[PDB]
Ligand binder design. Structure first.
Ligand SMILES: [Zn+2]
Ligand SMILES: [Zn+2]
Ligand SMILES: [Zn+2]
Ligand SMILES: [Zn+2]
Lengths: 351, 351, 351, 351
């Protein structure tokens, strides 16, 4: 079958890969709409996963079940489904410990464009269909549905890990797609003041739309000083790290109140060392908790998020700035993701 | 001073009570706007607190600081403040244990119309001003501010105790003021589906406004069966008990999924026994947690909720259906609260 | 094969049932040592599960893997294993929600002597061997190992649900096997004062051994008054309901401090209504949380508990008062469980 | 009055400071037994708190109430009390937020040898006696009681922050007094395997006594590799950082399982940057939570810990290796703390 893959480091191209076969509990899905991700860029142009040879890219997609294994009972061919980027192996000790995203290994829940071929192919494999798929509502716009697969689940996970309280002040560093969802999630957790950090005009408007009460731009001051000024030297209760370099951790620690929580959902892949400012971290006694983790996946997660969209708890349309029709547009969309033009948040390719 | 008080059981009337004096850490506040509560009715007409003799009623009010003790540093006379219904004694072992609402006794945080004269007087006493008051924003409508004092804090507390997850299905039993805030709080915690239970037209519209995706009326089926039908026999993740008789507990347990949480914010005062249906509760092994508690009070709580109002996280105006001007209207407003006419949610008396 | 089963309500007897076959992920185990349980009695003599026809009893056993399905990779025939009483279907939405004990239904984790034949047979079926079995340490006494299967996991679960703090005062109502483990678990959670409620001499000594600092007997006062007297009217932080009638709930609520937690691990099966004393529960505003749930099962749980035994964190030997050798003794052991002689805690039948 | 103070950086000596006066809610206490701390050394010889001029040292002591303010109701002169090292200002927004250790500032709960003169004086000041003191049991050995003030509360706090589960594997880095308490606390939280890291013979024996199942020495391998080998490449669930340089953070992250928790109770004061190994931290997506915080103080904390000692939940005697009689011995004891002889854990000076 045809599939857009990473030929080699810094080399992209369409290839003729084999068609995946479904195991007894698996499903073969044909993509209806997909979306390129920053991670795809990191994998190819930054060798985040080493020299992957001819591995199909993509992990964000909604599609149609084409084939189903003999044991799949809840999903059958023809079923339109939302595919969470994280598809864990539900039968593992990690799952029993309550950490699905790490079933059988650290970050093992993330299989697409890692352990196996991604969604940028005529067909892709989904392990344990009954446990990793969710039905796509008949009237849900494809572009929006694709946003659930990673953007929504990740951003919301940032807000969840942040353990936000009713009225908590929150700072979201990085207002890209994930950051915007972090803002949306923060608001949906009862956050009061939400300060989004970014400069891209399109992202700024989206940030405000999702709940940002204040917008800070690096271009006019050290972010911590700006936050401090806005909070009258008090600082903020929570900080969600969604974008930026490793230095953001230091900034997060510096702007969060002692006893606050810093939630990281930014997949760092460049500087090999995130640093905690000793003095600002109260020498490790300021009670400034630091959390960070891969977005939850699986059927339940997808269904719960889906239901939130169905009940209009969040409008994912604002994340989609570019929509292409026709499989061939994947390359252009991915390159767009690499070049990062000023008016881009997310791009969806509807087949 | 003049004050509307409970003369005796089932007897209401204005009296000439003494003017409260402020201790070193206390403040004497003059009400700007007050609101009658269902609890006031329960106290007077249902002897919920026994035969209280000439005790001034009310615990929902925003006012102006008239007098301040020598040790009060953050509040001075002239200051317009939001007074939380719960004003705990912050120096107690219960506070150290993390339960302010019970500082120095069960429900000891609730002093107005219980341990001391309420807010339905020319002046009222606030213990530990610096720890129990919050500045009322210059442009915040009085009617709305009063809703923060109890309705908002209680309803939101129900959603908080419910430990709602992103996408959780929630059933709110009782769509009166508190229930409406429970719905609003639920939505602000990321709830997906929110089923409100009630029939009063005005409350139903308010419920939908605050986030209710479905509305159920007792008049056409056993609530549990209706919930079951709506959820395809799956049940709901959370249940917030905001209104109704003791039987609602049984209904809550029956409709919540095993492992779910039932949050009670309904002050029961009639049937002296809430029953848990053994079979439905999985014989006490279904992991159906039951929580219940007085609304948090104090300065921080009031400020956090206030900030949420300032940041338009919730529109409290929909709770206020009746607004009177002039202290004398307290009686009429309280009686209105007793008669419960079809178009009443909350009534605010602006002095 | 031969198996001791419930012929009908109040009728016990050995029968010739068919031998269970192992599915691809299942295992057929031959019991090495088993233990009768109070639940077995409730099922037979109290029809707790209705009129079960010829269903083999028992759910507490350690054995040897005889047969293994083609997909079982971690367990092979000859392996000596600890079988948790709770063997969940790890591939379910409830598991994804974090509630294994209810995978595919309320209390669905408990299959033995419920959904299928128990362990009181020449062989018994274990679903998903790799996910529901644990290796029995070579030198671990069989009698002790059997205590892990239910007694330890349940009692400890009570302490876990109780969310005990370092120094918390805990009252354990019912000092039978489960209660004794509740006491042991409470101590292992850092509880300070532990008050055990019971009178049976043998259980009293065991209670003290496991950590009980005080022992209360109903025979000389209303338990709440006794607890109050001991705590100087202050009450206790936590209460674990391990035994007694439905009235214990009321007692638990009455003796626990507002903001405390009541953990129920007592499978109620008689009075069809547990009552919460309104006034003592602070009318549902005292922050007295009530939890209750089936013991966790599965491999991880069994392994973790096992490791605690291996590291001498708890001595399970004190639970075993009667040890029989020979399969035929199951009847006598079960009857002993029904008659409840003064010197009985738990009885183990080593085949 | 006489008091052992920090004359200047690296300069220790007895001085004639003024006697503290008690405010309305305060108490003046005379030390009965005190204990030098590593922090005292860091303050003096490492300028951890800058150039403190003539500030009396010490924050670990049990004493007798000499003077009591007019508002102190629970404590009167003659009362023997345990003084927690952390004495928060219970009337603050931080307390309302649930973080007493930071009342009115980061680490503001720690007043002795920071915001005011320490306990190494003829008399010392205790703010809010009723909220910050605990009665010393008549028969509790002074040396042991002093260990409660900081060592016990800190070590246990490490175990508490670690959110240990029944059977969790825990690694405690640094087996000094705090680390030993971390081990004891870990065991008291139901930890299964406890690996203590250290080499000092006296500390090693104490570690085993408190619950350490394994002891690792840096002298024979990279600690992570050793831990990995012991756990069969699986790693550990929790890691408590009690001692060592900033590099221990990296080691903790490297040895903890993804989804595990790292609890820091080591007051870092040397290298001004604790580093998180990007790759080992799963690039900030491994769910490896990092917590760290000052020991809880106040009356409730002290009483709960005290009760644990009373109920023999922990034997603090093993922490005390040196006991001196006579106030003058403070200097020798503090110097001993600086020189760190092989046979020293903690030293207590009984006046
Ligand atoms: Zn993605
Ligand atoms: Zn009210
Ligand atoms: Zn059993
Ligand atoms: Zn110290």
């Amino acid at each position: 079958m045809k599939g857009f893959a990473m030929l080699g480091i810094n080399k992209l191209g369409w290839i003729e890969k084999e068609r995946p076969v479904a195991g007894s509990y698996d499903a073969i899905v044909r993509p209806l709409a997909v979306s390129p991700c920053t991670s795809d860029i990191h994998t190819v142009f930054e060798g985040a996963l080493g020299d992957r040879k001819n591995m199909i890219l993509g992990h964000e997609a909604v599609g149609e079940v084409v084939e189903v294994g003999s044991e799949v009972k809840d999903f059958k061919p023809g079923d339109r489904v939302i595919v969470p980027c994280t598809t864990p192996d539900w039968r593992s000790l990690e799952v029993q410990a309550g950490f699905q995203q790490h079933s059988n290994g650290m970050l093992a829940g993330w299989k697409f464009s890692n352990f196996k071929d991604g969604v940028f192919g005529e067909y892709f494999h989904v392990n344990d269909a009954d446990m990793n798929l969710a039905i796509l509502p008949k009237d849900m716009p494809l572009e929006n549905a694709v946003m659930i697969t990673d953007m929504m689940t990740t951003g919301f996970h940032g807000a969840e890990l942040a353990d936000i309280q009713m009225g908590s002040s929150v700072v979201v560093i990085g207002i890209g797609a994930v950051g915007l969802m972090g803002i949306a999630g923060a608001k949906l957790r009862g956050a009061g003041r939400i300060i989004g950090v970014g400069s891209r005009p399109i992202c700024v408007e989206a940030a405000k739309f999702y709940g940002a009460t204040d917008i800070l731009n690096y271009k006019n001051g050290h972010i911590v000083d700006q936050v401090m000024k806005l909070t009258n030297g008090k600082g903020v209760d929570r900080v969600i790290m969604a974008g930026g370099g490793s230095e953001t951790l230091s900034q997060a620690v510096s702007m969060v109140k002692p006893g606050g929580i810093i939630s990281n959902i930014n997949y760092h892949g460049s500087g090999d060392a995130l640093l905690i400012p000793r003095v600002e971290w109260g020498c490790g006694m300021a009670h400034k908790t630091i959390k960070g983790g891969l977005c939850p996946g699986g059927r339940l997660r997808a269904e719960m998020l889906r239901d939130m969209v169905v009940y209009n708890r969040v409008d994912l349309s604002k994340l989609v700035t570019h929509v292409y029709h026709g499989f061939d547009h994947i390359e252009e969309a991915l390159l767009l993701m690499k070049d990062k033009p000023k008016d881009l948040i997310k791009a969806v390719v509807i087949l």
